[PDB]
Amino acid sequence: DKITSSDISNVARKEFLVEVQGQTDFLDVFRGTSYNVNNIRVKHRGNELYYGDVFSENSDFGSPGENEGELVPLDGFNIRLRQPCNIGDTVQIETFMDGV
Amino acid sequence: DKITSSDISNVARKEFLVEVQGQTDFLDVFRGTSYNVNNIRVKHRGNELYYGDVFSENSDFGSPGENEGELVPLDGFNIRLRQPCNIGDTVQIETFMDGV
Amino acid sequence: YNASSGQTLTAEWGKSYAINTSSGRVTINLPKGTVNDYNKVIRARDVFATWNVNPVTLVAASGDTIKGSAVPVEINVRFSDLELVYCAPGRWEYVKNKQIDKITSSDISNVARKEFLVEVQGQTDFLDVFRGTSYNVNNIRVKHRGNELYYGDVFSENSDFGSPGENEGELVPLDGFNIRLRQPCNIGDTVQIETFMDGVSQWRSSYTRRQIRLLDSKLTSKTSLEGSIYVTDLSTMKSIPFSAFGLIPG
Amino acid sequence: YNASSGQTLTAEWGKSYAINTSSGRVTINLPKGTVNDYNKVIRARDVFAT
């Protein structure tokens, strides 16, 4: 009687209210497990630019904790950002994740 | 004859061009029934700050029809906004509501 | 049937296959001319996915079309399952690449993202939107890196987007494929586009609990309240409907 | 099954039915009383759209 069909991917949101300045990275993404890279989600309330197929200087993304510059590969857990942003300028990060 | 399942049931959204100033609240949110508090989108075309786990002065949201100030709990039916915003700028709400 | 054997199999009416394309592309042709039979379902499937990768090739050769043109329809869909019947209008209907993974949003991958770094200014129109297939007319993302204005149901000078390639202005319908943007934006100012799909996940409850207290008849004299108070004649009505307990829409 | 035979078809469970209503509407009258058996589909489908 019923078409329930296919599958539902999983989006959750966690807003990061920026403080203290600094804050060019955010760790563990959503506390449990990992971020799903393919769809980058981060906002200044300006929604931040692609991480992208090719990590670029154009793409503004730090990617986890790179020593200098910022890391060319993206990692799910930890992310970085090229910007200090500003306190009160909110880094608003989401994922499109496979499992909850 | 191929048959399809869909999204809109599990994802819908509505966006408001602001007029008249005032307009500190928005009633029923989307047409009928309940909004779901846990996931919030208010967009100024910037995506407005979290309502958050805690209704705060940081978190900018009115929440339903609060007589003075703006309400601490969030009813899915009615919402409010601390700001009147301005005419010509557009508030954009997006809901996340689960199917059974 | 194996990818190892041929690049082609054909025509076994009720003999179902679970297909490999790994070794070589399979070009599968189906019985021709089919007389007055119809009613005949054919079953092709993935016992694994070498669909995608090396593609399928499905063929209704001249004869009675699968659908429309009948030009060979090719499955690059990783999992897929095939049922087409010979159907009285000389037609073979197979259903929306159901992979298992049933129904479809195909290469859509449900909710998805693309960004246009805008260059040489201009570039107001943005062609083909997401790479293949269609965009989804349901909902929009487009961006200046600030969120764009709402698109609106009827397309207004207010609601800011072009909709495909209108020679002057914005196109009064919005086609999925091509999309226009009213601003040329700038080199370095990106346009960034999505439609909507996937639904969302609920995290629901994680336990909680309910308990009811009823007293009977006039002894309450009061009606049920939330999951706190209930009232009835206890001997009259067995069981409970529960709105009687506290209800919340998980 | 063809509409031309009966205006109604009846009752035979595990038999798939490719249906033609062109001649007349198919009134498909399925068995009643059925004991406790269940477990049994019937199959009707469109070989084409009548």
From Swiss-Prot, chains A, B:
Induction: Expressed in the late phase of the viral replicative cycle. It is found in: Virion. Coiled coil: none annotated. Peripheral baseplate protein that is part of the tail fiber network. Connects the short tail fibers to the baseplate. During infection, the baseplate undergoes a conformational change from a dome-shaped to a star-shaped structure. At this point, gp10 rotates and acts as a lever that unfolds the short tail fibers, which then interact with host cell surface receptors. Involved in the tail assembly. Belongs to the T4likevirus baseplate wedge protein gp10 family. Homotrimer; disulfide-linked. Heteromultimer with gp7; a gp10 molecule is disulfide-linked to gp7 and the other two remaining gp10 molecules form a disulfide bond. The gp10 trimer interacts with gp11 trimer and with the short tail fiber (STF) composed of the gp12 trimer. Part of the baseplate macromolecular complex which consists of gp5, gp5.4, gp27 (central spike complex); gp6, gp25, gp53 (inner baseplate); gp7, gp8 (intermediate baseplate); gp9, gp10, gp11, gp12 (peripheral); gp48 and gp54 (proximal region of the tail tube). This is Baseplate wedge protein gp10. The lineage of its organism: Viruses, Duplodnaviria, Heunggongvirae, Uroviricota, Caudoviricetes. The chain holds residues 152 to 251 of 602 of the full protein.
